[PDB]
């Protein structure tokens, strides 16, 4: 049954590998948050960054548990796809928001100098360009995510666009 899905999820594996161990560990999540905070040209060991990293940590827990390995174990490529698949398909709605909520949230906190808890087009663009996206890409991705066409991207509409690269990538998830 696998065809185009393999390619998309396959690269995502080799696309990360912080240390290049051939697996996914928790320490890989910690560097991520840090590696990101820097992209916004700000602190490192501050609170906003510590918060995000703090959230990213618990995210691994779900993997070790669902995968059945350990908080200090590792997941293979074939494992990622199998477990990832269920995450996108299986799993409860509140399940993705529960474990990922604090992960995506931490990012919104740094991506808001007004403290409103929402992602405005001016905020979204700032992040897309931060990861290596063009100014024209943000404007396009923004409208695609605004499910309610209200002009504001809330945490809800955030995850939706985020996890949706399986079939015909639209936003390209977090990585970019």
Our finding on whether 28 is near Ca ion (CB under 5 A) is yes
Nearer to Ca ion, 37 or 154 (CB): 154
DSSP string, 9-46: HHHHHHH--SS--SSB-THHHHHHHHHHHHHTSS-SSS
Q: How far is the CB of 149 from Ca ion (least distance, A)?
A: 6
3-class DSSP state of 118: strand
Our finding on whether 148 is near Ca ion (CB under 5 A) is yes
Nearer to Ca ion, 7 or 17 (CB): 17
**In sequence order, what E strands does 82-160 have?**
118-120, 152-154
Q: How far is the CB of 1 from Ca ion (least distance, A)?
A: 28
Give the number of C-alpha atoms closer than 13 A to the C-alpha of residue 19, restricted to the C-beta side.
Answer: 11
**Helix, strand, coil percent content, the chain, rounded in steps of 5:** 60, 5, 35
Q: How far is the CB of 128 from Ca ion (least distance, A)?
A: 15
From 30, 77, 112, 173, residue interacting with Ca ion (rule: CB under 5 A):
112
Interface contacts to Ca ion, rule CB under 5 A: 17-18, 21, 28, 112, 114, 116, 118, 146, 148, 150, 157
């Amino acid at each position: 049954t696998t065809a185009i899905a393999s390619d998309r999820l396959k690269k995502r594996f080799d696309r990360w590998d912080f240390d290049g161990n051939g697996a996914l560990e928790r320490a890989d999540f910690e560097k991520e948050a840090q590696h990101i905070a820097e992209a916004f040209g700000k602190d490192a060991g501050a609170a906003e960054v510590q918060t995000l990293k703090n959230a990213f940590g618990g995210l691994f827990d779900y993997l070790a548990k669902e995968a059945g390995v350990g908080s200090d174990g590792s997941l293979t490529e074939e494992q990622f796809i199998r477990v990832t698949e269920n995450l996108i398909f299986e799993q409860g709605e509140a399940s993705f928001n529960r474990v990922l909520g604090p992960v995506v949230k931490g990012i919104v906190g740094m991506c808001d100098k007004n403290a409103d808890g929402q992602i405005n087009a001016d905020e979204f663009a700032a992040w897309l360009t931060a990861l290596g996206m063009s100014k024209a890409e943000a404007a396009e991705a923004f409208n695609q995510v605004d499910t309610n066409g209200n002009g504001e991207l809330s945490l809800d509409e955030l995850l939706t666009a985020v996890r949706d690269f399986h079939f015909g990538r639209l936003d390209v998830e977090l990585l970019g």
